Amino acid sequence: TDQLIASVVPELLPSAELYEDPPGLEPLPEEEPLIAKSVAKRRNEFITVRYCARQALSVLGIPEVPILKGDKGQPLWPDGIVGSMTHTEGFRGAVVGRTGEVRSVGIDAEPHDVLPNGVLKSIALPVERDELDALPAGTHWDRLLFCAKETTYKAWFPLTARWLGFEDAHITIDPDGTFTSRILVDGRANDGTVLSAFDGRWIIDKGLILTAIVVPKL
Amino acid sequence: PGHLASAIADEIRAVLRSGDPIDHHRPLETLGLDALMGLELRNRLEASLGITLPVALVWAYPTISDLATALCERM
Ligand SMILES: CCNC(=N)NC(=O)Nc1c(CC)cccc1CC
Ligand SMILES: [Mn+2]
Ligand SMILES: [Mn+2]
């Protein structure tokens, strides 16, 4: 499977992705007021990514259902379903799962490119910038660090409903396509478990970085 | 807050790379601002205003007016 998301998450979690905005897509009526005043780019990426999500949802048996946004913008999934969506230029992706098998999932997409000026300093711990320099050349480790941190937050928030700052997570990137997220604050979950470390995966292809984190049922 | 509101609007069009006037009560996500652009904007406000501003405030106050008034209380 040459698909980015399907290559870094288990097959148990159906995923769907698109690299353009196919003509004729539209939002569900309950979703239109969410983008009723947004510009063309924000509208297209919103509609296309939710098409991928609903396609991945029907693999799990879930029929056509609107996907709205919560208080902090998180996607509001049907009861029992946990998912994640991401969209950047040239990519729209979505993955869903049942909480009977996975408790959370997060994915993030970024162009394989150096971060803009000044961003790496505000999102990386001093120990992280040193580790990124020691990594082998040929890979924009700075943005792989940024995108993996967004994935850390996207898996953290649905099990926590609390803020996680860039300074609150220590990410160690391994060149073999894996990475770990070490949470530096107290990770109280709504379940009662403490969340201290995440296991992640990443892939670079077609000028795109894609990071993904799946928590296990334990 | 009105003097700073138009000052954030100048910075927003610099990260958004546009030249259109911005309604001060329209959320910036509807204009195409994403997480990376919000970090860019935050660093440009920290420079222009010379004050340490946390990143979580850009989305706690998702409009220009919501951001401007929250910033003068940081003065
Ligand atoms: C490990 C810590 N990293 C994060 N907390 N990252 C985000 O919060 N990113 C983000 C933001 C903040 C700029 C706004 C809207 C949407 C997103 C991504 C869902
Ligand atoms: Mn996006
Ligand atoms: Mn992102």
Numbering used by the authors:
A (entry chain A): 4 to 221
B (entry chain B): 2071 to 2145
Publication passage describing the model:
Phosphopantetheinyl transferases (PPTases) are essential enzymes involved in primary and secondary metabolite biosynthetic pathways. They catalyze the transfer of the 4ʹ‐phosphopantetheinyl (Ppant) moiety of coenzyme A (CoA) to a strictly conserved serine residue of carrier protein (CP) domains present in fatty acid synthases (FASs), polyketide synthases (PKSs) and non-ribosomal peptide synthetases (NRPSs). The covalent attachment of the 20 Å-long Ppant arm to CP domains allows tethering substrates and chemical intermediates through a reactive thioester bond and transferring them to the different catalytic centers of the synthases where enzymatic modifications can proceed. Owing to their role in activating enzymes essential for bacterial viability and pathogenicity, phosphopantetheinyl transferases represent novel and attractive drug targets.
Based on our previous studies, we have also been able to solve the 2.5 Å resolution X-ray structure of the complex formed between PptAb and its cognate ACP domain in the presence of CoA, Mn2+, and 8918. Only the residue Trp2129 is involved in binding through van der Waals contact and, by sitting on top of the diethylphenyl moiety of 8918, causing the displacement of the inhibitor along its longitudinal axis by about 0.9 Å.
